[PDB]
Design an enzyme around this catalytic site. Sequence first.
Site, PDB file in Angstrom:
ATOM      1  N   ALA A  96     -31.341 -31.574 -26.623  1.00  0.00           N
ATOM      2  CA  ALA A  96     -30.090 -31.027 -27.149  1.00  0.00           C
ATOM      3  C   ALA A  96     -29.388 -30.084 -26.167  1.00  0.00           C
ATOM      4  O   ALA A  96     -28.182 -29.887 -26.233  1.00  0.00           O
ATOM      5  CB  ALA A  96     -30.358 -30.304 -28.471  1.00  0.00           C
ATOM      6  N   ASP A  97     -30.165 -29.549 -25.233  1.00  0.00           N
ATOM      7  CA  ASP A  97     -29.710 -28.597 -24.219  1.00  0.00           C
ATOM      8  C   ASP A  97     -29.848 -29.201 -22.824  1.00  0.00           C
ATOM      9  O   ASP A  97     -29.650 -28.515 -21.828  1.00  0.00           O
ATOM     10  CB  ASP A  97     -30.627 -27.376 -24.372  1.00  0.00           C
ATOM     11  CG  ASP A  97     -30.471 -26.328 -23.222  1.00  0.00           C
ATOM     12  OD1 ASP A  97     -29.412 -25.664 -23.199  1.00  0.00           O
ATOM     13  OD2 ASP A  97     -31.364 -26.200 -22.357  1.00  0.00           O
TER      14      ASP A  97
END
Lengths: 493, 77, 339
Positions: free
Chosen positions: B30-31
């Site tokens: 997600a990052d």
Amino acid sequence: EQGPSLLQNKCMGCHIPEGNDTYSRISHQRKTPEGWLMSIARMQVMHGLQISDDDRRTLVKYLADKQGLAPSETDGVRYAMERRLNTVEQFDTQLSETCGRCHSGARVALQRRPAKEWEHLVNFHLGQWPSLEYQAQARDRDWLPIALQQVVPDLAKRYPLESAAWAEWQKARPKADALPGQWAFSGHMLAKGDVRGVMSVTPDQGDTFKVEVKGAYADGTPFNGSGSAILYNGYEWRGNVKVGDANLRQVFAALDGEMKGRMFEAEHDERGLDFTAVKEGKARLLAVQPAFIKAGGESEITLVGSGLAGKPDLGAGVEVTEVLEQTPTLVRLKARAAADAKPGQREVAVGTLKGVNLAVYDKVEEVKVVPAFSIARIGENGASVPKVQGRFEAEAWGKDANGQPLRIGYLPASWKVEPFNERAVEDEDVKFAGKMQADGVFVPGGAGPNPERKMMTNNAGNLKVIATLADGGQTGEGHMIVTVQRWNNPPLP
Amino acid sequence: AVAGCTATTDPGWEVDAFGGVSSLCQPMEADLYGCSDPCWWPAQVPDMMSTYQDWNAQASNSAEDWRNLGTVFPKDK
Amino acid sequence: GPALKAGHEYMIVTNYPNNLHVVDVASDTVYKSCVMPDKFGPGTAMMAPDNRTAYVLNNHYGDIYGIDLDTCKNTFHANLSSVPGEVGRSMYSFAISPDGKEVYATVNPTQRLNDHYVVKPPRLEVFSTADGLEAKPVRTFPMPRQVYLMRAADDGSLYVAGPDIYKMDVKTGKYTVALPLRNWNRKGYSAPDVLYFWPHQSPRHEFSMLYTIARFATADLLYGYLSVDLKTGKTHTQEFADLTELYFTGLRSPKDPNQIYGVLNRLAKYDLKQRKLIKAANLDHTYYCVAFDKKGDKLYLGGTFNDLAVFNPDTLEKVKNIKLPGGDMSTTTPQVFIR
Ligand code: HEC
Ligand code: HEC
Ligand code: NI
């Protein structure tokens, strides 16, 4: 081709000729063999250089010999080449915040450059990665001015292009003809055990050699292999030996008929063994395996070394009951320590040869998990990266007859994992992070998001590594963090 | 800190600022591009702003195509 | 494709391949999608005063494009590398004039020579939006280092986020410190830390960013909120909670300004006055950027993967998810506007 012609055919055009095979930038820096490989690799990835693996190998050899580091210029930072990635670096804060917050500070210390080359390096960083000055430990200060005015001059003073060491090394540098022969070796693989044997080095084309490893671990598993090696700058030994089903890289420093370094799996650098060897021709006593004997006990001890002749004396209170074998490089014996034998180190000897110590102990007092802190990484499961294991050992400590601390050695133990903090308990880290095996090897979970976890997170975890001694049940504690992968993995961390 | 992890914790990559892995991205994917697009962690995560611009070509959706992400160092062979 | 309807609320978000999607806020469905030119990165967008043209920093932080949402047409393009032998990058630093006639961008250039790089001083470059697809600097001024987010106030002034927040005259290029951050010599506290790549175009019409600060290692970690009123130029800062977790973005509800919502791994709801956490919600995964609709009845969570989480700000619970075509939103910032 020859180093000089390849230098011109492949680097000229971007690098300006300055006279007799010297070029801009290239001839004003000194690095390790993997440092040179890293610079050339950057040329391919960043600047479009077209070069085969063969020609790249030729240039690295050429540049590593011409512009390398003296042995003493690598002192204390060899762990980087040895791929000891769990090493906790100890550099000054300025170098750490400015230069070691991305990659290791050792990558910096393994290079020698004049101030202008250090200045060009700073410009390249901020130029290639514009976000550099907005990142942590950069956005809080005037990064560029500090790096150019404070850091560049410090880097130039600490790691200069010219030094007496390099000058005296260029003259005293031995040839590769000094390495062929038989080499008695001793080593230890974390969570696996001791290893000993003989490495036969025979010549081949130029500074390359044929290598034969013949030995075994203390547990009886064989350590026989065949491979080859190259020698850079007269001491930087780089080899590859296929031992069983695994190719092992050898990164040793060959100096004074002695080889010191590390041998690890080419594919997994956490899986390796410390390695020390001695060339035949000089009488040395490498190690005692095991290096401890419990008081009132019976144990098979084997001495490793070169030119072993004489009768083994293991010190006061220790009895050699049966010399199971006695060759010049390996002496196997049965020993027995009296229940009365005073706890303490014993100067072991084979004839007049001394050098190694034997810890005689009565009881284990304190236990330390080694390494105390380490990083395990998820991997595989379809990913382009492998799992990075946590490998541990339980280090025993007691007290000698003089009431002083006594390091016994690495004693067998039971291993388990427990949540490091309340957060780890809540997220069920011990269930997803991986599996701790009886032998002290932690195998992390598979990579990727895990649907079974909160927020479909990875099989990462904050773990407490518990070792409990088989001998008395004394416990030891370590700290392990199982994290995510990294895809950029150059030769030097 | 360990030699082969990063020390720039925004919140980090190997370890967060708090010394753990919880303040990190969940899941890490997600990052991932938040880390990759602006070359925030160039030594571990490949930079798409400058060096490896088409790194995520076969993995536009990191949640499902994370396996298609390759290593970047030009290794022998 | 379909032109946007007047009076209707919309939201733009950029997606990985290289898409710009228009979300119809009423039905929480994708109204239309536009494929963007060149390559994605960062994909940061802001709506022009015409409520019709979106300006996007794309192509690996080196270009600015103007896309007409009603037709998906690329109407403007400014390359940030107009100086010979230099490569220019913008660290999320671009802004649109109040009348929509100029676009500003601070460029951190690097001179790339045959065997070395030379980092050059930054500069603000002004582009006229009327210049089309081959726009070039019509004015350029010197800029300090470490400049990121910028927002043009109503009176034409440019608020620049750098070591300190500056107020800049786009005609003369002279600037002063509007709000000291690094040089905020606040006793008993450390200097604040600001990491923000999301220029929210919120209903409150203010340039806001979160920051952390240590209040004297024993130092107490606090989260703060800074804001520049784009109408009056009034500045404001204030800590709203002791730091127990990190938040990437945070916005004040246009419905109730005393409530600030931050997000990262959890979505937290704070009481500004009381400096108290009122409620926190667990997320399906990490989200970077919050977005409030006009009335503050919905709270969208974007960035990261390819889905928008829609929350009821009162109950703090996820109502639904808008699945976007393509992939990761990455560092994109969801922008809400009335057509
Ligand atoms: C202090 C100002 C620093 C010094 C001195 C050096 N670095 Fe770095 N650095 C970074 C990357 C991503 C790379 C290479 C790419 C990769 O690892 O795949 C490097 C490389 C170097 C090298 C190798 C140079 C060569 O081969 O020619 C040296 C000598 C070096 N660095 C010195 C990243 C970063 C970074 C994070 C954004 C920082 C702060 C620094 N490097 C700082 C320094
Ligand atoms: C043109 C496309 C290039 C070719 C061919 C080679 N190099 Fe290069 N090199 C180039 C640039 C633009 C730069 C400066 C920026 C940078 O990447 O560092 C360099 C730099 C070097 C350096 C200095 C590295 C440092 O960290 O200071 C070295 C040591 C270097 N180049 C070596 C090198 C060699 C050995 C080459 C032949 C195979 C070579 N370069 C080719 C551009 C180009
Ligand atoms: Ni203890």
